[PDB]
Write a protein that binds this ligand. Structure first.
Ligand code: ZSM
Ligand code: ZSM
Length: 330
């Protein structure tokens, strides 16, 4: 089997991407944030504290004839931005782009933090990291991908995120029309539960490539590209007037600037992030200071190849017995 679903930016800045997901019988369609940096499928629901729901579509398990309460199971998770959510667990039928899993753990939120409430466009998360990170207790649950894998034509999924445009998540096949050139595969460590890999270096604009190992994670659930301070300083030094702002929380730059590209290495291959992809727009409405899309990972404890990087590529998440990642230009 295979599945194929379109993923759409939530706003004009590509702050996150949502993908429609069918849950239950009859189907209830929710728009979820597919997150290769976590491993829980959780949804706003009829159980969510009423004051914490503001415009999201909810899952109502009592209206699904295939929903079953997973007795005694609870979950609780935190995200890189300090947001969090928690609740109880059902199993139900979940379909993505025509691919169906029965018995998928659907984590129903009883509580969500304010940043989830305030974002009406995201109805929950669909985790695609390794199932060892799943938070359900006392019996850990498998991700949608893990549950689907045995049925898939090939044990892979692919991320093809758009820049200010829709893109695609495919399960079970590699669309050879969706990329240029070849896919370069690279080793993954699963020891932290992430799609963790080592980039072979970087270049800024038309500058020379610096060969240096950069360990980090392929994370569709993080918006920006977080890299070591040395790398990020080298990038922003090429932008007149750019500075690191302690009060804003990162590098900012004049909105009048034209940004240079940023290249990262995948083995001997090179993925080029166009400069425009690094512009995250005014720091506050009406400002002429703009927020940068490449930020320091110092203090986060890991480098993160988030959407800024991934959207410049066609990315294969190969979930064979020894997982690997693939990257192609597009
Ligand atoms: N694990 C560590 N000690 S590094 C801290 C860290 C790890 C992962 C993320 C992204 S989580 C996500 N995409 N839901 C953010 C921060
Ligand atoms: N806690 C605060 N000082 S402001 C909290 C807050 C953030 C964002 C908005 C606009 S998005 C919306 N209304 N859903 C409204 C309130």
């Amino acid at each position: 089997s295979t599945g194929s679903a379109t993923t759409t930016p939530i706003d004009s800045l590509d702050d996150a991407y949502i993908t429609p997901v069918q849950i239950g019988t009859p189907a209830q369609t929710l728009n979820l944030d597919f997150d290769t940096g976590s491993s829980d499928l959780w949804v706003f629901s009829s159980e969510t504290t009423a004051s914490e729901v503001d415009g999201q579509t909810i899952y109502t398990p009592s209206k699904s004839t295939t929903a079953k309460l997973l007795s005694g199971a609870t979950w609780s998770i935190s995200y890189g931005d300090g947001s969090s959510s928690s609740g109880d667990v059902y199993t139900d039928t979940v379909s993505v782009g025509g691919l169906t899993v029965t018995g998928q753990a659907v984590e129903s939120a009883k509580k969500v933090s304010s940043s989830f409430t305030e974002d009406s466009t995201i109805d929950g998360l669909l985790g695609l990291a390794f199932s060892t990170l799943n938070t359900v207790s006392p019996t850990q649950q498998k991700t949608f991908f893990d549950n689907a894998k045995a049925s898939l034509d090939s044990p892979v999924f692919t991320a093809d995120l758009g820049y200010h445009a829709p893109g695609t998540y495919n399960f079970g096949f590699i669309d050879t029309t969706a990329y240029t050139g070849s896919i370069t595969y690279t080793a993954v460590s699963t020891k932290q539960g992430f799609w963790e890999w080592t980039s072979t270096g970087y270049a800024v604009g038309s500058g020379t490539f610096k060969s240096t190992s950069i360990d980090g994670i392929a994370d569709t659930g993080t918006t920006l590209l977080y890299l070591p301070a040395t790398v990020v300083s080298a990038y922003w030094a090429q932008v007149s007037g750019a500075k690191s702002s302690s009060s804003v929380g990162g590098y900012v730059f004049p909105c009048s600037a034209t940004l240079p590209s940023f290249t990262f290495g995948v083995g001997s291959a090179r993925i080029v992030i166009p400069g425009d992809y690094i512009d995250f727009g005014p720091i506050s409405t009406g400002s002429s200071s703009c927020f940068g899309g490449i930020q320091s990972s110092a203090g986060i404890g890991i480098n993160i190849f988030g959407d800024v990087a991934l959207k410049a590529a066609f990315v294969v998440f190969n979930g064979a017995t020894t997982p690997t990642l693939g990257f192609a230009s597009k």
